[PDB]
Structures are given as C-alpha cells and as structure tokens.
Amino acid sequence: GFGALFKFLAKKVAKTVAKQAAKQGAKYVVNKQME
C-alpha cells in the first residue's frame, strides 16, 4: 500500500551508508589481526 517509500528511502537509506562505506570493510580482519 505504501509504495512511496521506494522513492523516499532512497534519500535516507542511501544517505548514511554513502558515508559509512567502510563500516563493514574491515570487521573479520580487525579482530583477526589481534589474535
């Protein structure tokens, strides 16, 4: 019913992630290097 979020979330969901492109770039190696 609410098909307006497919054009409204593109301004939100695709706004914070653009800056956090490294939030998951190093997670399985950051803790592995410590070991």
Among 20, 18, 13, CA closest to 5: 13
The answer to whether the Cα torsion of 13, 19, 25, 31 is positive or negative is negative
CA 11 to chain centroid, in Å, comes to: 13
7 to each of 1, 20, 33, how far by Cα in Å? 14, 21, 41
Q: What is the C-alpha separation between 3 and 9, in angstroms, rounded?
A: 11
User: Of all helices (H) and strands (E), which one includes residue 15?
Assistant: helix 13-16
Greatest CA span in the chain, whole angstroms? 50
Question: Could you tell me how many residues make up the chain?
Answer: 35
What is d(CA 10, CA 2) in angstroms, rounded to the nearest whole number? 14
Listed residue (18, 21, 19, 1) closest to 10, CA to CA: 18
The method recorded for this entry reads NMR
Residue ranges covered by each domain of the chain: 1-35
What is the CA angle 19-10-15, rounded to 5? 15
The CA radius of gyration of the chain, in Å to the nearest whole number, is 16
